Amino acid sequence: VSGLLMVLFKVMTDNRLVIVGETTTPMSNTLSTVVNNVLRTTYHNNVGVN
Amino acid sequence: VHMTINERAGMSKLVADNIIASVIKSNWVVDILDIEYTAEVMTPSEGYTQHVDAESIMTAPKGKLFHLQFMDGLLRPEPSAFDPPASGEDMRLIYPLQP
Amino acid sequence: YGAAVVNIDLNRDFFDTATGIDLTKGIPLVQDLLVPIGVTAGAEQSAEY
Amino acid sequence: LSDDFKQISDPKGYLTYSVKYEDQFTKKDKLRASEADDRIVGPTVNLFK
Amino acid sequence: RYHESVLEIADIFDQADFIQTSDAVRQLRALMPTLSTSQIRHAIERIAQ
DSSP, rough: OOOHHHHHHHHHTTOOOEEHHHHHHHGGGOOHHHHHHOOOEEEEEEOOOO | EEEESSSSTTHHHHHHHHHHHHHHSSEEEEEESSSSEEOOOGGGOOOOOOOOOOOHHHSSTTBBEEEEEHHHHGGGGOOOSSSOOOSSOOOOOOSSSSS | OOOOOOOOOOOOSSSSSGTTOOOSSSSOEEEEEEEOSSSSSTTTTTTOO | OOOEEEEEOOOOOOOOOOOOOOOTOOOOOOOOOOOOHHHTTTTHHTTTO | OOOOOOOOGTTTSOGGGOOOOOOHHHHHHHHHHOHHHHHHHHHHHHOOO
């Protein structure tokens, strides 16, 4: 219960404000078409998993 | 099988080696449209200065310019009448799709 | 006599290295013109043409 | 007038994937495609290897 | 059942004074990757350099 509370508090006080990070803009010809269909010009260098 | 490969991008090394094996054994014809390339046209005396293994053709990144070389064998003088017969056979894998 | 092949390439002397152009492979090429942003462009990129 | 926000660049989620591999079937060695597509597809490919 | 094709502006207009180019520019643009605006700026700075 204490853990759910600290999660809730840590979310209630998540005063983060995203600024644009390092971001690639790959030349389109280098990307396999399946990736090109997904990508929209730029993307963060720190693409996460998905 | 006239297999057309529009894009090699996700293709596994296993599958690529296997497709090449099918080209050699089942006599597949595998057109590969992904590749962009330049073509120096060699003359028989200058030989083939550069080389391209099938592995590299199946695994080179898209958007890189491949530099293939193609011999014009037209200026190859006839063999001496007394040269020993060739028991073997010269072969070839890479061809252009276009002039 | 004995000329294997005659070609009609672009004049490398005119489109010099001063223009950033290479012509060793038959096509014109120019580096760092059309490039990815945030990463180094790969070598021998087709976009160079 | 206020220090209301902590500015940050590459935000981390509350959730995240976790994955236990079967060591017998996993090649610990990294997978990779072309540099272009490994830049994107990459970490996803390695997580769900 | 159609046939897509480029059609030069000169074939439509009769006034030559306002027609500077041809099909060839469109064909060249068809050769180009789609460019993000920063890539366009990069190209312009390159040519300038």
